[PDB]
Amino acid sequence: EFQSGSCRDKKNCKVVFSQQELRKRLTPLQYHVTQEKGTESAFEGEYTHHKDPGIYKCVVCGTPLFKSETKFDSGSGWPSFHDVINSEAITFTDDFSYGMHRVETSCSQCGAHLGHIFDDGPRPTGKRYCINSAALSFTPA
Amino acid sequence: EFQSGSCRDKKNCKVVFSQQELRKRLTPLQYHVTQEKGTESAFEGEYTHHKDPGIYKCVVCGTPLFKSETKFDSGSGWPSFHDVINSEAITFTDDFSYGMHRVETSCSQCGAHLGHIFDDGPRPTGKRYCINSAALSFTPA
Ligand SMILES: [Cl-]
Ligand SMILES: [Zn+2]
Ligand SMILES: [Zn+2]
């Protein structure tokens, strides 16, 4: 159960940035993914096969999102995680694009589009997060 | 364990087609996928969310490849099957593109590129055949 929509949809993001700042700080791909609900090409993401210990953060606002301990590589075209660093970090939206229903995931502080979540992950959580590398930055442990 | 290479690599395909014939018959996308080892964009394939009972065949030569009973949908960008219709239908090749090791799958009869096989699949096989929709045709039951 969840109220559907990003904090941009709900008009209540805690963190905001000017477009001038966003355009000069983000690459065009990072901007398109996080600001226009884009998806990075499969197998081209910088963090798809990254295994270093550390924390993945929102590329836009720097809020921590995922711990390296929860990352796994099984052959998906994009980074995959078992769990979010804490329940407050991500917001959910019902997504009906491409002729299917998915649950889209966004940063709860600035509203950046991140990826999608699926209900078929192993225990304990039962979840699997498919996340665009272009939506993340990485801080080594 | 397998000898690596398509029947084109091994110079022993049972069936061959003229390249003018193939161009007339296949769309540019089907040609690029099957003849140039291409990959279709995620979520755009005709059979990605297809559920009708029947049999999927090689789009080039017509050989049966997959039964609808083995198809599953876990949210992948491409059609997913857990087993091939018979052990002789598909040939395997070690593939090192995109900074990865994958096992590429091709039609044993004509050498057409189909997709890849992974070890992250469900029981009973543990295998996921990740197959481009553009490499397939479908015959309803
Ligand atoms: Cl893609
Ligand atoms: Zn953010
Ligand atoms: Zn064939």
Residue numbers in the entry:
A (entry chain B), B (entry chain A): -3 to 137
Q: What does the report in the manuscript say about this coordinate set?
A:
Two main classes of methionine sulfoxide reductase (Msr) enzymes catalyze MetSO reduction to restore the unmodified methionine: MsrA enzymes reduce the S epimer, and MsrB enzymes reduce the R epimer. MsrB1 has an active-site selenocysteine and is found in the nucleus and cytosol. Both MsrB2 and MsrB3 contain active-site cysteines, but MsrB2 is present in mitochondria, and MsrB3, the focus of this article, has distinct splice variants targeted to mitochondria (MsrB3B isoform) or the endoplasmic reticulum (ER) (MsrB3A isoform, hereafter referred to as MsrB3). As anticipated, the MsrB3 structure has the characteristic Mss4-like fold found for other MsrB proteins, consisting of two highly twisted, short-stranded β sheets. The cysteines Cys3 and Cys9, in the CX5C motif, were found to be disulfide bonded to one another adjacent to the zinc-coordinating site and far (∼21 Å) from the active-site cysteine, Cys126.
A truncated version of MsrB3 was then produced, spanning residues 1–137 of the mature protein. This version was crystallized without reductive methylation in a different crystal form, also with two molecules in the asymmetric unit, and diffraction data were collected to 1.71 Å resolution. Molecular replacement using the initial MsrB3 model was used to phase the new crystal form. Truncated MsrB3 also contained additional electron density in the active site. In this case, the species appeared to be covalently bound to the active-site cysteine. Based on previous observations that crystallization in the presence of cacodylate buffer can result in modified cysteine residues, together with inspection of simulated annealing composite omit maps, the density was modeled as a dimethylarsinoyl modification, in which the arsenic is bonded to the cysteine sulfur by displacement of one of the oxygen atoms of the cacodylate. Ser72 and Ser76 coordinate a water molecule instead of a sulfenic acid in the dimethylarsinoyl-modified form. A comparison of the active-site regions of the two crystal forms shows good superposition of all the functional groups that are in hydrogen bonding distance of the sulfenic acid or bound water molecule. Only the region around Ser70, which forms hydrogen bonds to Ser72 and Ser76 but is 4.0 Å away from the sulfenic acid, is altered in the dimethylarsinoyl-modified form due to a local and minor change in loop structure with a maximum backbone displacement of 2.7 Å.
